[PDB]
Amino acid sequence: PIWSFDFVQSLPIQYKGESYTSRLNKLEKDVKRMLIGVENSLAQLELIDTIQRLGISYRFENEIISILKEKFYDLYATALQFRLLRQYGFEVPQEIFNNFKNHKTGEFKANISNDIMGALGLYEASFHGKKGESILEEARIFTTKCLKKYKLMSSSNNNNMTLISLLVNHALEMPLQWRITRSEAKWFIEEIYERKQDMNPTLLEFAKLDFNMLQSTYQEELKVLSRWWKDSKLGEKLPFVRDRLVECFLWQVGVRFEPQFSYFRIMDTKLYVLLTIIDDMHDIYGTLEELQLFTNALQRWDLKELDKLPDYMKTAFYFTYNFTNELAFDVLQEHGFVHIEYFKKLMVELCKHHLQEAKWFYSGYKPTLQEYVENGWLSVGGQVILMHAYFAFTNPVTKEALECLKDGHPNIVRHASIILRLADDLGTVPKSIQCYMHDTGASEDEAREHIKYLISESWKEMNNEDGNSFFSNEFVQVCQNLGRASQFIYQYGDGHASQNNLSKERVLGLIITPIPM
Amino acid sequence: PIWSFDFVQSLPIQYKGESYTSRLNKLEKDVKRMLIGVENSLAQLELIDTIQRLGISYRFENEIISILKEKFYDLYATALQFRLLRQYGFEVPQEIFNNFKNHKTGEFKANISNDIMGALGLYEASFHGKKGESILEEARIFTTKCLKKYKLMSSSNNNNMTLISLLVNHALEMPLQWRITRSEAKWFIEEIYERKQDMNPTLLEFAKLDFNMLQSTYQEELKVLSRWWKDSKLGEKLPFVRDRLVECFLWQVGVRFEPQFSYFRIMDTKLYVLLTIIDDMHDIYGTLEELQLFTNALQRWDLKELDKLPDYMKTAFYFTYNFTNELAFDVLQEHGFVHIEYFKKLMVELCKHHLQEAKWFYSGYKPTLQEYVENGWLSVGGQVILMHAYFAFTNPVTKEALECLKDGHPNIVRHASIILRLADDLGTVPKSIQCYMHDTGASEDEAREHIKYLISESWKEMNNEDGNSFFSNEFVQVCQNLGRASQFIYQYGDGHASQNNLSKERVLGLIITPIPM
C-alpha cells in the first residue's frame, strides 16, 4: 500500500535520547514557572489558552486547575474565562453572557460585529454549552453570522489574511472544542504562534520539541503495529479488507495522544482494524446467508462453528475470538475479574446490528432517520471502543457501575457513537442524508445541515457530563476525543476509504514529518 | 530484575542502516567469490570449515552444497571431509576411517597421538555418527583420550596455550556439533581467527559485521518482548514466576538465530515463558488439589472453569488458553486449516505429565531412570516447542504427516526432548541423577557419566534423521538446534534459574556488547 512495510520500518526515529528528554524537562520547568509567574490575571488566561492551543496543556493540568480554582471586563475576556472554567468542569451558567444581550430585543448587540476578537471568543465558548442553555445556542448563531461578515469583508480586501483572518477561517472550519489536540497544535505552532509579536521562544521550542518527541513515539508504535499487521496475514486471507492500518493509528492519535497511553493506542488500533474487517465484510463482501452464519457462530461462540463457515469467515471469526479473549485477559489482569461475557455480548450486538442493516438492504426497506440512527450508533462499533477505553481508564469499577453497564450503554457513549456514525456518513445502502431526503424530501444541503444539527445536539449531550456521575472526567474526555477524531477524520474528504492528497498530508504532518525547530 | 525494562528500551541499536546493509552485501559477495574461487581442494574444505565456525555459513548454503556435491590423504583432511559430507546430509559410512585402524588389534594407531590436528579432526567428526556405527564411537573414545594427553602435556608446560591448545580446550569442553552458532562464532572471531597468520581481513570484517547486525536485530526483538512482558502483567498476578525473559530469548537465539526467523523468536519466547510458568507452578507453587483442578480445566477447556480456580490459576489458565488459540490462528493463516484440538492435546499432555511428577512426589514414590525419562521428556515441554517449529517451518503438510503426528510424537522430537530434560537436570523432587543413584547405587560422578551417555545416545538418534523421512532438513536442524541450546544453557552453571557471572557474561557478549570492529 501507500505506507509500505519497509518504509514504516525504515523511519529514522530522531527525537529520542537523553539530551531530548533533558531539554524537555528543562523547558517544561521553565514554561511552568512562566505560567504560574504571570502577574496579570488576564494575561494568565491568555497564556493558558495559548498552551492549550499548543497541545502542551496536558502536562500543566493541575497548575491550570489551581489557577482556575483561584479564579473563582469586556466580551473577549468574559468568553475566554467562561470557556476555560467550563472546560475544566467548573460550574458557570450561561446567564453571565446576559450582560451582552440587548434585552429590548433579546439578541446580542450589533456593536459585537466591531469586536472581532470578542465575537470569536464567544463563538469558541458557545460550543461548550449543554442542552437547555438557549443563550449559548443563540450566541453560537449570532457569532457564526458575525464571523462570516469578517470573511466577506477581510479576505475579499486582498490576500491580507491577517492572523485574525486566519483564526476566523480556522474557527469557521471547525471550533476548538471539536478539533483534536495534535492537528491544532501543529497548526498553531506553524501558522500562528510563530508570527505573533508577543511570542516567547521558550514556549515555541518546548511545543515543537514535545510534538516531535510524540511523533517519534508514534513512529515506534506504528512500526510495532505494522509488524503485527504483517504477521497477522489478514490481507492475504481477507483480500476485501482495505489496508488502512495507518488510518486506524491516526484514529488512535486523535483519541488518546498522551505519551503514557502508548499500549492503548496499539490495542484500540487492532480493535478499529477488527471493526473495519467486520464493516467491509457486512456491506461489501459477505452475502446474507454467510453473514447470518457468522452472527449465529458469534452467538454460539465456539470453534466447532468454523467447520460451518467459509475460509474467510473462519479467519475473521477466529480473529474476533482471539481479540475478544485478549480484551478479557487484559481486563482480568487489570481489575482481577473475568468479563468475557460482556465483551462477547458487545461483539454479538455489533454483528446483530450489522446484520440488521444488511437485512434492511436486501429486503428493500428504507428506514427513517430515527430508526437508522438507533441502529447505526450500535452498528458503528463506537460502543466497543468506548467500553475498551472505560475498562482501560476507570479504576476501580464498582458493582453498581457494572450493574448499570449490564443494563444498556451510557448516554454519553450512545451520543458519541451517534456523532461517530453521522460524521462517517458525512462525505460518503442508503445512510443518514439519504434516509432524511427520503422521509422529509428536502435537498441535499438541507439534509446535511440537519445532520450537523444532530451532531451539535449530541455534542451538547456529551457536554452535559462535564459537570454524581458514574464516569470519571478522564473517560468523558476520551468520549469527547472520539467525537473530535470523528470530526477530524471525515472533516473534508473520505479520509478513511479514499487515499487523496489530504489523507497523505495529514499523515505526513502528524506522523512522519516533524516540525522544523 | 537484572535486565530492567528501561535498560532494555534504552539499548542504542547501532548496527542498523543503509550503509551497514551495503557493506554487508559487498562483503558477502566478496566472501562468496573467495570461497568458490579457491583452487586447492583441501584449502576449500578449510575455508568452508572456517566460515562455518565464523557463523556465516548460513548465507553460503547452496554454494557449499554444490562444492560438496562436486567433492563426491592424511587423517585431518579425511576427518574434515567426512564431517562436512555427513553434515550436509551426504551419505558416507564410517568404514572409511578403517584406513587408520590397526586391525591387528582393532584400534586406531598410536602415532595418531603425534598428529594433534588429525586427532582433533577425528574427535570433531565422531559426534556426527549414528546408532550402529561403532567405529565412530571407538574413534570418539580414542580421540578424547588423545586430547586429554595434549592437555596434560601442553597446558602444563606453561600458559603457552597455543591456538592448538585453545582449540583442544574448546573441543574437550564441548564439540562443534553440540555448540550453537552464535557462541562459537563470537569465540572463533575473538580468540582464534584474529590470531591466525593466514587470516583474511574481508572474512573477519564480514563475520564481525554480520554478528553485530544480528545483535541489533536481537536487541529490537528483545525490546518488543520486554514491552510484551510489561503489558502482560504476569509478574504481578503470578509472583512465583522468575523474570527470565532474556533467558528465554537467549534460548530462541540458540534455536533459530537466522535473521529471517525474527517473528518465530518472539512467539517461541512467549511459549518458553508459558512453559516456565507451568513448570514453576507445578513443582514449587501449586498444591496437589489446585494442580488437579488446573489439569481438569485444561481437559475441559472452557472459561466457566475459571470460577472453580484461584486467581493465579485463573491468570495462568487464561494465558494458556489465549496463547494456544493464537498458535492455532497462526497455523490457520499459514496452512489454511484449524488445528486447535492438536495444540489443546499437546497442552493437556504436558500438564498431565507435570501432574504425574507432582503425584509421584507427594505419594513418596521414587521412579526408575527409565520411567523418569519416559515421563520427563513429555513433562519438559520440548514436544510443544518442536511442534511449533514443525508447523512454522514445514510447508506444505500432507494428510499422511498429520495422521503420523496424531499417533504420537516423532522419534527425533522425543530424543530431542530427552536431551532437553537431561541437560536441564544437569547442574540442578528427585530427578535424573538422583533416580539413577537410587536404583543402581553408583556415585554421583558415575550417575552424571551415565546421563552423558544417554545424551550421546540421543544425539546419535537425532543424527540418524540427517540422511523417505516425513521431516524436512530444516526441521531436523531445528531439533538439533534445540539440543545444542539445551547443552549451551545448562553447560556450566544453572543459567536458567540462577543469576551468576556466566549468566551475565553470555547475555552481554551475545546480545548487548557487539564485537569490536
Strand partners, B101: B108
> Which residue of chain A has the CA closest to B317?
A329
Q: B330: Cβ–Cβ under 8 A, 6 or more apart, which residues?
A: A231, B267, B391, B392
Mutate one of B311, B333, B334 to test the A interface: name it (highest A CB count within 10 A): B333
Q: Is the peptide bond before B396 cis (omega within 30 degrees of 0)?
A: yes
Question: Do B322 and A314 make contact, defined as CB atoms within 8 angstroms?
Answer: no
Helix (H, G, I), strand (E, B) or coil at B101: strand
H or E element at residue A107: strand A107-108
Length of chain B: 517
- Does B6 reach chain A within 8 Å, measured CB to CB? no
Identify the residue whose cell numbers are 535486565: B3
Residues of B with CB below 8 A from A263's CB? 227, 231
Q: Which three cell numbers stand for residue A316?
A: 475473521
Helix (H, G, I), strand (E, B) or coil at A296: helix
d(CA B102, CA B366): 47
Helix (H, G, I), strand (E, B) or coil at A158: coil
List the one residue out of B243, B264, B220, B216 whose CA is nearest residue B9.
B220
Residues of A with CB below 8 A from B232's CB? 333
Q: Count of CB atoms within 10 A of residue A422's CB?
A: 25
Residue A52 is part of a domain; what is its CATH number?
1.50.10.130
d(CA B59, CA B45): 16
List the one residue out of A481, A496, A506, A376 whose CA is nearest residue A435.
A376
* One domain for residues A182 and A298: no
Question: Do A232 and B333 make contact, defined as CB atoms within 8 angstroms?
Answer: yes
d(CA A197, CA A490): 34
Task: Measure in Å the smallest separation between the Cα of A331 and chain B Cα atoms.
Answer: 11
Cβ pair A333, A392 in contact under 8 A: no
Q: Give Cα A431 to chain centroid, integer Å.
A: 21
List the one residue out of B77, B68, B115 whose CA is nearest residue B96.
B77
Q: Give Cα B411 to chain centroid, integer Å.
A: 17
Q: A397: Cβ–Cβ under 8 A, 6 or more apart, which residues?
A: A335, A391
Q: Which three cell numbers stand for residue B324?
A: 494456544
Q: Which three cell numbers stand for residue B56?
A: 556465516
Task: Report how this structure was experimentally obtained.
Answer: X-ray
DSSP letters for A203-220: HHHHHHHHHHHHHHHHHH
Length of chain A: 517
**Residue A227 assigned to a binding site:** no
Helix (H, G, I), strand (E, B) or coil at A137: helix
- Does B237 reach chain A within 8 Å, measured CB to CB? yes
Of B236, B315, B325, the CB nearest to A321: B325
Q: Which three cell numbers stand for residue A455?
A: 451532531
* One domain for residues B52 and B143: yes
Cβ pair B144, B123 in contact under 8 A: yes
DSSP letters for B289-335: HHHHHHHHHHHHT-GGGGGGS-HHHHHHHHHHHHHHHHHHHHHHHHH
Q: Which three cell numbers stand for residue A508?
A: 505526513
Q: Which three cell numbers stand for residue B32?
A: 562468496
Buried residues in B365-377 as b, exposed as e (16+ CB within 10 A): eebebeebbebbb
Question: Do A315 and B334 make contact, defined as CB atoms within 8 angstroms?
Answer: no
Of A231, A303, A330, the CB nearest to B338: A303
d(CA B95, CA B256): 34
State the SS3 of B354-399.
HHHHHHHHHCCCCCCHHHHHHHHHHHCCHHHHHHHHHHHHCCCCCH
Task: Measure in Å the smallest separation between the Cα of B320 and chain A Cα atoms.
Answer: 11
Q: Which three cell numbers stand for residue B172?
A: 574437550
Helix (H, G, I), strand (E, B) or coil at B498: coil
Last-in-domain residue among B198, B221, B256: B198
In the DSSP assignment, the letter for residue A504 is: H
Q: Count of CB atoms within 10 A of residue B143's CB?
A: 24
Q: Which amino acid is at B219?
A: Q
Task: Specify if A472 maps to a domain.
Answer: yes
| Phi and psi at residue B15, to the nearest 5° | -75, 70
Angle between helices B473-489 and B382-393 (to 10 degrees): 140
d(CA A207, CA A59): 11
Helix (H, G, I), strand (E, B) or coil at A243: coil
* One domain for residues B53 and B137: yes
Whole-angstrom CA distances from B335 to A309, B329, B394, B470 are 17, 10, 10, 17
List the one residue out of A468, A305, A462 whose CA is nearest residue A401.
A468
Percent helix / strand / coil, chain A, rounded to 5: 75, 0, 25
Strands A107-108 and A101-102: antiparallel
Q: Which three cell numbers stand for residue B67?
A: 562444492
Cβ pair A34, A202 in contact under 8 A: yes
Angle between helices B288-300 and B311-335 (to 10 degrees): 30
Residues of B with CB below 8 A from A315's CB? 332-333
- Does B334 reach chain A within 8 Å, measured CB to CB? yes
Q: Which amino acid is at A68?
A: L
Cβ pair A161, A169 in contact under 8 A: yes
Helix (H, G, I), strand (E, B) or coil at A108: strand
List the one residue out of B386, B428, B456, B434 whose CA is nearest residue B133.
B456
> Which residue of chain B has the CA closest to A324?
B322
- Does B236 reach chain A within 8 Å, measured CB to CB? yes
Task: Specify if B209 maps to a domain.
Answer: no
Identify the residue whose cell numbers are 586429554: B148
Whole-angstrom CA distances from B330 to B309, B336, B345 are 29, 9, 17
d(CA B421, CA B377): 6
In the DSSP assignment, the letter for residue A179 is: S
In the DSSP assignment, the letter for residue A471 is: S
- Does B239 reach chain A within 8 Å, measured CB to CB? no
Task: Specify if A190 maps to a domain.
Answer: yes
The dihedral through the CA atoms of B225, A218, A63, A479 has a sign that is negative
**Is residue A333 packed enough to be buried (19+ CB in 10 Å), middle (13-18) or exposed (0-12)?**
middle
List the one residue out of B99, B109, B57 whose CA is nearest residue B79.
B99
d(CA A236, CA A223): 20
Q: B110: Cβ–Cβ under 8 A, 6 or more apart, which residues?
A: none
Task: Specify if B365 maps to a domain.
Answer: yes
Q: B40: Cβ–Cβ under 8 A, 6 or more apart, which residues?
A: none
Question: Do B325 and A318 make contact, defined as CB atoms within 8 angstroms?
Answer: yes
Whole-angstrom CA distances from B283 to B92, B344, B360 are 46, 22, 11
Last-in-domain residue among B144, B177, B198: B198
Identify the residue whose cell numbers are 450537523: A452
List the one residue out of A254, A263, A275 whose CA is nearest residue A323.
A275
d(CA B331, CA A322): 14
Identify the residue whose cell numbers are 456593536: A111
| Phi and psi at residue B107, to the nearest 5° | -130, 155
Residues of B with CB below 8 A from A392's CB? none
Residue A320 is part of a domain; what is its CATH number?
1.10.600.10
d(CA A282, CA A395): 35
* One domain for residues B190 and B246: no
Q: Which amino acid is at B254?
A: G
Of B307, B314, B338, the CB nearest to A332: B314
d(CA B358, CA B283): 7
Of B233, B307, B322, the CB nearest to A326: B322
* One domain for residues A328 and A420: yes
List the one residue out of B54, B300, B162 whose CA is nearest residue B292.
B300
Q: Count of CB atoms within 10 A of residue B500's CB?
A: 11
Helix (H, G, I), strand (E, B) or coil at A286: coil
For chain A, the first-to-last Cα distance in angstroms comes to 31
Cβ pair A181, A218 in contact under 8 A: no
Helix (H, G, I), strand (E, B) or coil at A161: coil
Cβ pair A121, A75 in contact under 8 A: yes
Task: Specify if B17 maps to a domain.
Answer: no
DSSP letters for A216-233: HHHHHHHHHHHHHHHHHT
**Residue B279 assigned to a binding site:** yes
Helix (H, G, I), strand (E, B) or coil at A101: strand
Mutate one of A277, A323, A338 to test the B interface: name it (highest B CB count within 10 A): A338
Give counts: helices (H), strands (E), chain A.
24, 2
Task: Specify if A145 maps to a domain.
Answer: yes
Task: Specify if A34 maps to a domain.
Answer: no
Radius of gyration of chain B (CA): 24
d(CA A379, CA A278): 10
In the DSSP assignment, the letter for residue A510 is: I
Locate breaks in chain B with C to N over 2.5 A; list the residue preceding each. 72, 428, 467
List, in sequence order, the alpha helices (H) in B1-133. Answer: 5-10, 18-36, 41-53, 61-70, 75-87, 116-125
Phi-psi region of A172 (alpha: psi -120 to 50; beta: other; left: phi over 0): alpha
Residues of A with CB below 8 A from B317's CB? none
- Does A300 reach chain B within 8 Å, measured CB to CB? no
List the one residue out of B175, B119, B165, B111 whose CA is nearest residue B142.
B119
List, in sequence order, the alpha helices (H) in B174-232. Answer: 181-187, 201-232
> Which residue of chain B has the CA closest to A233?
B333
Task: Specify if A484 maps to a domain.
Answer: yes
**Is residue B487 packed enough to be buried (19+ CB in 10 Å), middle (13-18) or exposed (0-12)?**
buried
* One domain for residues B326 and B191: no
d(CA B181, CA B177): 10
Cβ pair A317, A306 in contact under 8 A: yes
* Torsion angle in degrees (nearest 10) through CA of B232, B264, B375, B328: 70
Q: B434: Cβ–Cβ under 8 A, 6 or more apart, which residues?
A: none
Q: Which amino acid is at A480?
A: Q
d(CA B297, CA A504): 51
Helix (H, G, I), strand (E, B) or coil at A442: coil
Residue B123: half-sphere exposure toward Cβ, Cα within 13 Å: 26
Cβ pair A214, A182 in contact under 8 A: yes
d(CA A224, CA A267): 11
State the SS3 of A41-86.
HHHHHHHHHHHHHCCCCCCCHHHHHHHHHHCCCCHHHHHHHHHHHH
Residues of A with CB below 8 A from B332's CB? 314-315, 318
**Residue A283 assigned to a binding site:** yes
* One domain for residues A320 and A411: yes
d(CA B436, CA B448): 9
Q: Which domain holds residue A367?
A: 244-512
**Is residue A249 packed enough to be buried (19+ CB in 10 Å), middle (13-18) or exposed (0-12)?**
buried
Residues of B with CB below 8 A from A329's CB? 318-319, 322
List, in sequence order, the alpha helices (H) in A281-310. Answer: 288-300
Last-in-domain residue among A176, A195, A214: A195
Of B233, B330, B338, the CB nearest to A333: B233
Cβ pair A255, A482 in contact under 8 A: yes
Helix (H, G, I), strand (E, B) or coil at A238: coil
d(CA B398, CA B403): 9
Strands B101-102 and A107-108: unpaired
**Is residue B502 packed enough to be buried (19+ CB in 10 Å), middle (13-18) or exposed (0-12)?**
middle
Task: Measure in Å the smallest separation between the Cα of A246 and chain B Cα atoms.
Answer: 20
DSSP letters for B236-259: HH-TTS---HHHHHHHHHHH--SG
Task: Measure in Å the smallest separation between the Cα of A291 and chain B Cα atoms.
Answer: 20
> Which residue of chain A has the CA closest to B337?
A311
Resolution in A: 3.2
Identify the residue whose cell numbers are 458514574: A470
* One domain for residues B189 and B241: no
d(CA B296, CA A13): 49
* One domain for residues B135 and B239: no
Task: Measure in Å the smallest separation between the Cα of A266 and chain B Cα atoms.
Answer: 11
- Does A232 reach chain B within 8 Å, measured CB to CB? yes
d(CA A331, CA B436): 47
Locate breaks in chain A with C to N over 2.5 A; list the residue preceding each. 72, 428, 467
Question: Do A336 and B311 make contact, defined as CB atoms within 8 angstroms?
Answer: yes
**Residue B23 assigned to a binding site:** no
| Phi and psi at residue A186, to the nearest 5° | -60, -45
| Phi and psi at residue B403, to the nearest 5° | -70, -35
**Residue B242 assigned to a binding site:** yes
Q: Which three cell numbers stand for residue A49?
A: 489558552
> Which residue of chain A has the CA closest to B263?
A231
Residue B280: half-sphere exposure toward Cβ, Cα within 13 Å: 19
Residues of A with CB below 8 A from B236's CB? 333
Angle between helices B340-362 and B382-393 (to 10 degrees): 170
Helix (H, G, I), strand (E, B) or coil at B220: helix
Question: Do B231 and A340 make contact, defined as CB atoms within 8 angstroms?
Answer: no
Question: Structurally, how many domains does chain A consist of?
Answer: 2
State the SS3 of B139-176.
HHHHHHHHHHHHHHHHHCCCCCCCHHHHHHHHHHHCCC
* One domain for residues B141 and B272: no
d(CA B179, CA A189): 58
Q: Which three cell numbers stand for residue B348?
A: 493437556
Question: Do B328 and A334 make contact, defined as CB atoms within 8 angstroms?
Answer: no
Of B303, B325, B329, the CB nearest to A338: B303
List the one residue out of B166, B194, B175 whose CA is nearest residue B122.
B175
Q: What angle do CA A85, A88, A89 make, to 5 degrees?
A: 90
Whole-angstrom CA distances from B477 to A47, A303, B54, B160, B468 are 66, 34, 18, 37, 17
Cβ pair A285, A257 in contact under 8 A: no
| Phi and psi at residue B441, to the nearest 5° | 90, 10
**Residue B202 assigned to a binding site:** no
Buried residues in A103-140 as b, exposed as e (16+ CB within 10 A): eeeeebeeebbebbebbbbbbbbbbbbbeebebbbbbb
**Is residue A37 packed enough to be buried (19+ CB in 10 Å), middle (13-18) or exposed (0-12)?**
exposed
- Does A334 reach chain B within 8 Å, measured CB to CB? yes
Of A224, A231, A315, the CB nearest to B332: A315
* One domain for residues A270 and A141: no
Question: Do B332 and A340 make contact, defined as CB atoms within 8 angstroms?
Answer: no
Strands B101-102 and B107-108: antiparallel
Cβ pair B316, B282 in contact under 8 A: no
Q: Which three cell numbers stand for residue A253?
A: 492519535
* One domain for residues B405 and B476: yes
Mutate one of A263, A266, A325 to test the B interface: name it (highest B CB count within 10 A): A325
Q: A306: Cβ–Cβ under 8 A, 6 or more apart, which residues?
A: A297, A314, A317, A318, B338
List the one residue out of B93, B162, B165 whose CA is nearest residue B129.
B93
Cβ pair A433, A447 in contact under 8 A: yes
